[PDB]
Amino acid sequence: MKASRLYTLVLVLQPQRVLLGMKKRGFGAGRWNGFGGKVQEGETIEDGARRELQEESGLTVDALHKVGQIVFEFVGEPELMDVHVFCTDSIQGTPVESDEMRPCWFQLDQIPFKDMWPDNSYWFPLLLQKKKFHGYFKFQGQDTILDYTLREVDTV
Numbered sequence: 001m002k003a004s005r006l007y008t009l010v011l012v013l014q015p016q017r018v019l020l021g022m023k024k025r026g027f028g029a030g031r032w033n034g035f036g037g038k039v040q041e042g043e044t045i046e047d048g049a050r051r052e053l054q055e056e057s058g059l060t061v062d063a064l065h066k067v068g069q070i071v072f073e074f075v076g077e078p079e080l081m082d083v084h085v086f087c088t089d090s091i092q093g094t095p096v097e098s099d100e101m102r103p104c105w106f107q108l109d110q111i112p113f114k115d116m117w118p119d120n121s122y123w124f125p126l127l128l129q130k131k132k133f134h135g136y137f138k139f140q141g142q143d144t145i146l147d148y149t150l151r152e153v154d155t156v
Protein backbone atom coordinates (compact mmCIF):
# COMPACT_ATOMS: atom_id res chain seq x y z
CA MET A 1 0.00 0.00 0.00
CA LYS A 2 1.25 3.42 -0.99
CA ALA A 3 2.21 6.03 1.53
CA SER A 4 -0.31 8.77 2.00
CA ARG A 5 -0.10 12.44 2.63
CA LEU A 6 -2.56 14.21 4.82
CA TYR A 7 -4.85 16.86 3.43
CA THR A 8 -7.92 18.66 4.56
CA LEU A 9 -11.04 19.72 2.77
CA VAL A 10 -13.54 22.11 4.27
CA LEU A 11 -17.07 22.58 3.04
CA VAL A 12 -18.71 25.74 4.19
CA LEU A 13 -22.25 24.46 4.14
CA GLN A 14 -25.12 26.63 5.24
CA PRO A 15 -28.80 25.68 5.16
CA GLN A 16 -29.36 26.76 1.60
CA ARG A 17 -25.94 27.36 0.15
CA VAL A 18 -22.41 26.12 0.00
CA LEU A 19 -19.27 28.14 -0.50
CA LEU A 20 -16.82 26.71 -2.97
CA GLY A 21 -13.58 27.96 -4.36
CA MET A 22 -12.67 27.98 -8.00
CA LYS A 23 -9.09 27.21 -8.87
CA LYS A 24 -7.97 30.22 -10.84
CA ARG A 25 -4.43 29.30 -11.98
CA GLY A 26 -2.52 26.23 -13.06
CA PHE A 27 -3.84 23.16 -14.78
CA GLY A 28 -7.23 22.24 -13.46
CA ALA A 29 -8.24 25.90 -13.36
CA GLY A 30 -11.97 26.22 -13.44
CA ARG A 31 -12.77 23.47 -10.91
CA TRP A 32 -14.80 24.30 -7.83
CA ASN A 33 -13.69 22.69 -4.63
CA GLY A 34 -13.86 22.98 -0.93
CA PHE A 35 -11.00 24.68 0.85
CA GLY A 36 -8.01 22.91 2.21
CA GLY A 37 -4.53 21.72 1.72
CA LYS A 38 -1.74 19.79 3.27
CA VAL A 39 -1.64 19.23 6.99
CA GLN A 40 1.57 20.61 8.39
CA GLU A 41 3.91 19.21 10.97
CA GLY A 42 2.72 19.54 14.54
CA GLU A 43 -0.89 20.58 13.93
CA THR A 44 -3.96 18.48 14.39
CA ILE A 45 -5.90 17.70 11.28
CA GLU A 46 -8.77 19.91 12.38
CA ASP A 47 -6.40 22.77 13.09
CA GLY A 48 -4.84 22.27 9.69
CA ALA A 49 -8.30 22.43 8.18
CA ARG A 50 -9.05 25.64 10.02
CA ARG A 51 -5.71 27.06 9.00
CA GLU A 52 -6.16 26.20 5.35
CA LEU A 53 -9.69 27.58 5.36
CA GLN A 54 -8.38 30.87 6.70
CA GLU A 55 -5.34 30.98 4.43
CA GLU A 56 -7.31 30.11 1.32
CA SER A 57 -10.57 31.97 1.90
CA GLY A 58 -10.02 34.39 4.74
CA LEU A 59 -12.75 32.74 6.75
CA THR A 60 -12.33 31.72 10.31
CA VAL A 61 -14.47 29.36 12.31
CA ASP A 62 -14.36 28.39 15.94
CA ALA A 63 -15.11 24.74 15.16
CA LEU A 64 -15.22 22.32 12.30
CA HIS A 65 -17.14 19.06 12.19
CA LYS A 66 -15.46 16.08 10.60
CA VAL A 67 -17.80 14.55 8.07
CA GLY A 68 -15.72 12.22 5.98
CA GLN A 69 -12.43 10.90 4.86
CA ILE A 70 -11.54 10.23 1.29
CA VAL A 71 -8.41 8.70 -0.10
CA PHE A 72 -7.44 9.70 -3.58
CA GLU A 73 -5.10 7.73 -5.73
CA PHE A 74 -3.86 9.08 -9.01
CA VAL A 75 -2.36 6.90 -11.69
CA GLY A 76 1.22 7.82 -12.03
CA GLU A 77 1.58 9.32 -8.58
CA PRO A 78 3.30 7.52 -5.73
CA GLU A 79 1.36 8.81 -2.82
CA LEU A 80 -2.22 8.63 -1.82
CA MET A 81 -3.95 11.78 -0.75
CA ASP A 82 -5.68 11.17 2.54
CA VAL A 83 -8.28 13.88 2.66
CA HIS A 84 -10.08 14.63 5.87
CA VAL A 85 -13.31 16.37 5.15
CA PHE A 86 -14.89 18.88 7.46
CA CYS A 87 -17.92 21.06 7.45
CA THR A 88 -18.09 24.50 9.04
CA ASP A 89 -20.37 25.33 11.94
CA SER A 90 -20.58 29.16 11.97
CA ILE A 91 -18.23 31.07 9.69
CA GLN A 92 -16.83 34.54 10.48
CA GLY A 93 -15.99 36.95 7.88
CA THR A 94 -16.35 37.24 4.23
CA PRO A 95 -14.59 35.03 1.77
CA VAL A 96 -11.78 36.68 -0.10
CA GLU A 97 -10.67 36.08 -3.66
CA SER A 98 -6.97 35.50 -4.06
CA ASP A 99 -4.80 35.08 -7.10
CA GLU A 100 -5.30 31.31 -6.74
CA MET A 101 -8.95 30.94 -5.70
CA ARG A 102 -12.22 32.69 -6.34
CA PRO A 103 -14.88 31.92 -3.76
CA CYS A 104 -18.46 31.69 -4.64
CA TRP A 105 -21.68 30.72 -2.91
CA PHE A 106 -23.92 28.23 -4.65
CA GLN A 107 -27.46 27.51 -3.70
CA LEU A 108 -27.97 23.88 -2.80
CA ASP A 109 -30.16 23.36 -5.84
CA GLN A 110 -27.31 24.68 -7.99
CA ILE A 111 -24.38 22.64 -6.77
CA PRO A 112 -21.96 22.82 -9.68
CA PHE A 113 -21.15 19.14 -9.79
CA LYS A 114 -20.11 19.17 -13.42
CA ASP A 115 -17.39 21.66 -12.52
CA MET A 116 -16.31 19.93 -9.32
CA TRP A 117 -14.03 16.98 -8.83
CA PRO A 118 -15.94 13.97 -10.16
CA ASP A 119 -15.88 12.26 -6.83
CA ASN A 120 -17.92 15.08 -5.31
CA SER A 121 -21.01 13.83 -7.11
CA TYR A 122 -20.77 10.68 -5.07
CA TRP A 123 -20.02 11.91 -1.58
CA PHE A 124 -21.36 15.43 -1.42
CA PRO A 125 -24.94 14.08 -1.49
CA LEU A 126 -24.10 12.12 1.64
CA LEU A 127 -22.69 15.22 3.27
CA LEU A 128 -25.92 17.06 2.46
CA GLN A 129 -27.92 14.31 4.18
CA LYS A 130 -25.76 14.71 7.30
CA LYS A 131 -24.21 11.35 6.67
CA LYS A 132 -20.58 10.64 7.35
CA PHE A 133 -18.55 8.73 4.85
CA HIS A 134 -15.34 7.05 3.94
CA GLY A 135 -14.33 7.00 0.34
CA TYR A 136 -11.55 6.08 -1.99
CA PHE A 137 -11.23 7.14 -5.56
CA LYS A 138 -8.60 6.20 -8.10
CA PHE A 139 -8.24 8.70 -10.88
CA GLN A 140 -6.57 8.63 -14.20
CA GLY A 141 -5.82 12.29 -14.59
CA GLN A 142 -8.35 14.82 -13.35
CA ASP A 143 -11.56 13.48 -14.86
CA THR A 144 -11.64 9.70 -14.98
CA ILE A 145 -12.37 7.45 -12.06
CA LEU A 146 -11.05 3.94 -12.54
CA ASP A 147 -12.10 2.54 -9.18
CA TYR A 148 -13.80 3.86 -6.15
CA THR A 149 -15.36 2.82 -2.92
CA LEU A 150 -17.72 4.78 -0.79
CA ARG A 151 -19.45 3.89 2.42
CA GLU A 152 -21.61 5.69 4.85
CA VAL A 153 -20.12 5.33 8.31
CA ASP A 154 -21.43 6.12 11.74
CA THR A 155 -18.04 7.37 12.91
CA VAL A 156 -15.49 8.94 10.62
Ligand SMILES: Nc1[nH]c(=O)nc2c1ncn2[C@H]1C[C@H](O)[C@@H](COP(=O)(O)OP(=O)(O)OP(=O)(O)O)O1
Binds near residue numbers: 007033117
Ligand atom coordinates in the same frame (compact mmCIF):
# COMPACT_ATOMS: atom_id res chain seq x y z
N1 LIG B 1 -10.63 14.52 -5.92
C1 LIG B 1 -10.72 15.55 -5.06
N2 LIG B 1 -11.90 15.91 -4.55
C2 LIG B 1 -12.08 16.96 -3.70
O1 LIG B 1 -13.25 17.23 -3.38
N3 LIG B 1 -11.03 17.68 -3.25
C3 LIG B 1 -9.84 17.27 -3.72
C4 LIG B 1 -9.63 16.25 -4.63
N4 LIG B 1 -8.31 16.14 -4.88
C5 LIG B 1 -7.73 17.10 -4.13
N5 LIG B 1 -8.66 17.77 -3.44
C6 LIG B 1 -8.47 18.84 -2.46
C7 LIG B 1 -7.81 18.33 -1.18
C8 LIG B 1 -7.14 19.57 -0.66
O2 LIG B 1 -8.08 20.44 -0.10
C9 LIG B 1 -6.62 20.16 -1.96
C10 LIG B 1 -5.25 19.65 -2.34
O3 LIG B 1 -4.29 20.27 -1.52
P1 LIG B 1 -3.26 21.28 -2.14
O4 LIG B 1 -2.39 20.54 -3.11
O5 LIG B 1 -4.11 22.46 -2.45
O6 LIG B 1 -2.44 21.56 -0.81
P2 LIG B 1 -1.67 22.89 -0.41
O7 LIG B 1 -2.54 24.10 -0.67
O8 LIG B 1 -1.22 22.58 0.96
O9 LIG B 1 -0.41 22.79 -1.44
P3 LIG B 1 0.42 24.10 -1.90
O10 LIG B 1 -0.63 25.08 -2.38
O11 LIG B 1 1.36 23.63 -2.98
O12 LIG B 1 1.14 24.48 -0.63
O13 LIG B 1 -7.53 19.75 -2.97
Ligand code: NA
Binds near residue numbers: 056
Ligand atom coordinates in the same frame (compact mmCIF):
# COMPACT_ATOMS: atom_id res chain seq x y z
NA1 NA C 1 -5.02 24.25 -1.19
Ligand code: NA
Binds near residue numbers: 052
Ligand atom coordinates in the same frame (compact mmCIF):
# COMPACT_ATOMS: atom_id res chain seq x y z
NA1 NA D 1 -0.83 24.49 2.50
